[PDB]
Each structure stands twice: as structure tokens, then as C-alpha cells.
Design a protein around this nucleic acid. Structure first.
Length: 67
RNA sequence: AUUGAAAGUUGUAGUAUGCGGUCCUUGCGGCUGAGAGCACUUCAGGAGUUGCCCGCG
């Protein structure tokens, strides 16, 4: 939720509304959002750790809960 | 957004190569299921009986 929002300026708040201070373009902000979201796909698939060439761990997701 | 903030203990690596469970070896030689032995002894197909009855080439 803070992607593209400067840490020091969560909101700019000049028209008396606390709308987010999105200093960057909203479209590429959303693009960064789905890029970060899709970065999780090669995480629970077998692309974690070292010795990938020689080991490539035998991986499978057992169970999970997300909110 | 906590003396926290940025961060791969990282990348490349075959225990591998040749190595006969191998060569010889009889389950072999001798050996009577053999000798004795009545399907024997008694025995009627048996006792009765009109080819029957009439006859002019």
C-alpha cells in the first residue's frame, strides 16, 4: 500500500482531504504492484536458497492462509 | 516506522574408470513283490397231448 508514496509524506493534504501523496505516475505504480505480486510466484515453486544447479530442492506447498 | 534502515555465505564440481563367483564333478554300484492254490461239489426243461374234424370230376 505504500509503493510510490514517500515515507515522509504519506499524504500531501492541501485541499482538506487525506488522499495519498502519490509522487509517481499511478499507472506504473500499479504496474510495480503487480510486478511485486508476481514476484511471489517464483518463490513457492523451488527458486529459494542456494545450490540450485546441483540441488534444485524438491518443493511442494502443503497448506497456507493469506489475508 | 523499533541502532533499526541497504544485504545469497554466493557462484562452478560424476567417487569415477577397467573387474567371469571362475575352472574339475555319474546320486554311482548289487536287488525274483516270489513261492503254494479245483469255481469246485449235487441237477430230466420236466410232466399231459388224434392236424382236430364233413367229402360222387
Amino acid at each position: 500500500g505504500l509503493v510510490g508514496i514517500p515515507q515522509g509524506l504519506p499524504v500531501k493534504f492541501e485541499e482538506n482531504q487525506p488522499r495519498p501523496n502519490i509522487v509517481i505516475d499511478p499507472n506504473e505504480r500499479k504496474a510495480r504492484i503487480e510486478s511485486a505480486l508476481k514476484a511471489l510466484i517464483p518463490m513457492l515453486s523451488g527458486y529459494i536458497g542456494a545450490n540450485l544447479a546441483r540441488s534444485f530442492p524438491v518443493f511442494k506447498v502443503e497448506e497456507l492462509v493469506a489475508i
